[PDB]
Structure 1
Amino acid sequence: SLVKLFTTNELMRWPIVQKTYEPVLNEDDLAFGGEANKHHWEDLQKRVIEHNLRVISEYYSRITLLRLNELLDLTESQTETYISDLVNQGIIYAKVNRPAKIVNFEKPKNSSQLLNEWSHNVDELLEHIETIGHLITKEEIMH
């Protein structure tokens, strides 16, 4: 039930996931466990939000900054620290606006991308028409 959560892309907010698996997994030892062990447990938080952000870059191309804070359940100052940390690490591409406009995750849209995608598309078309053609031959025999 723990692994299968984090693999699916349906985001999930920290306060609750905490709760949920606390009386279950904190019982067991290594990583989680007793008193010393709690200063390793902590990291799980950090994991949750860099998974959420990661999902959001893919689906949201445009999102307002105030909204992104609401989702992450964090004050404005922490949210912005973390976005910065993710781009350094290269996990996501980000453009932030501090007067509280927009944070855009969209791909920087270059010349190359438009053309190369178009190039591909066209071969795929040609490939389709051919395939259709083999199968009309077949249907004569059937019929």
Structure 2
Amino acid sequence: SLVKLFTTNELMRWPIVQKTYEPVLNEDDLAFGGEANKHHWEDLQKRVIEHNLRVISEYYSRITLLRLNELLDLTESQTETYISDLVNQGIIYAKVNRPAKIVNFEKPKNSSQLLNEWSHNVDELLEHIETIGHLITKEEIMHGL
């Protein structure tokens, strides 16, 4: 479930699952080097935030920055910190308006509008004759038999 947790992660139950079942998570004495358990909370929390911003861009296209801080488990200063890191590293892309406090998806305009995006309607005009050709044949089978 931790692998599939990346699909839906609100970070609301994230500290609860780690404190309940912690075989390798919070306290791990096997196959992990370190001087203390402080590396378990730091390394695990920074990675789940990176996977958090990836799926949110594919779900919420436009969201207010005020309500965004509660879903990402971040503050006003911590929100723009992880956003700028993923853009500089070539991970994801988004829209951040400081004065407007509005976070959008920044939809690319390079699709040439009706030259590409509109071509998705070819399945609408194509399936018309396919249903008619199947209907005429189907009506004659039940009528003759």
Q: Considering the TM-score relative to the shorter chain, is it more than 0.5?
A: yes
Q: Which residue of 2 aligns with 1:21?
A: 21
| Alpha-carbon shift at residue 12 of structure 1 (Å) | 5.2
Q: Which residue of 1 aligns with 2:119?
A: 119
Q: Counterparts of 1:24 and 1:75 in 2: how far apart (Å)?
A: 29
Is the contact made by 1:64 and 1:102 (CA closer than 8 Å) also made in structure 2?
yes
Is the contact made by 2:49 and 2:72 (CA closer than 8 Å) also made in structure 1?
yes
| Alpha-carbon shift at residue 96 of structure 1 (Å) | 0.8
Q: Which runs of 5 or more structure 2 residues have no equivalent in the other structure?
A: none
- TM-score between the two structures when normalised by the length of structure 1: 0.74
Q: Which has the higher helix share?
A: 1
Q: Counterparts of 2:20 and 2:41 in 1: how far apart (Å)?
A: 14
| Alpha-carbon shift at residue 116 of structure 1 (Å) | 0.7
Q: Counterparts of 2:31 and 2:94 in 1: how far apart (Å)?
A: 32
| Alpha-carbon shift at residue 29 of structure 1 (Å) | 4.5
Q: Look up the SS of the partner of 2:129 in the other structure.
A: helix
- Structure 1 vs Structure 2: percent identity of aligned residues? 100
| Alpha-carbon shift at residue 42 of structure 1 (Å) | 2.4
The Cα offsets for residues 24-69 of structure 1, whole Å up to 9 and x where unpaired, read as 6445455657745652652211121122211211111111112111
Q: Counterparts of 1:12 and 1:115 in 2: how far apart (Å)?
A: 43
Given the superposition, is the C-alpha separation of residues 11 and 35 from structure 1 closer, same or farther in structure 2, using an over 3 Å criterion? same
Moved >6 Å (runs of 4+): none
Q: Look up the SS of the partner of 1:60 in the other structure.
A: coil
Is the contact made by 1:14 and 1:49 (CA closer than 8 Å) also made in structure 2?
no
- TM-score between the two structures when normalised by the length of structure 2: 0.73
Cα-Cα RMSD: 3.1
Q: Counterparts of 1:99 and 1:138 in 2: how far apart (Å)?
A: 62
| Alpha-carbon shift at residue 83 of structure 1 (Å) | 0.3
Given the superposition, is the C-alpha separation of residues 136 and 38 from structure 1 closer, same or farther in structure 2, using an over 3 Å criterion? farther
Alignment of 1:1-143 (within 5 A): 1-7=1-7, 14-22=14-22, 25-30=25-30, 35=35, 38-39=38-39, 42-110=42-110, 112-122=112-122, 124-143=124-143
Q: How many residues align?
A: 143
| Alpha-carbon shift at residue 88 of structure 1 (Å) | 1.8
Q: Look up the SS of the partner of 2:87 in the other structure.
A: helix
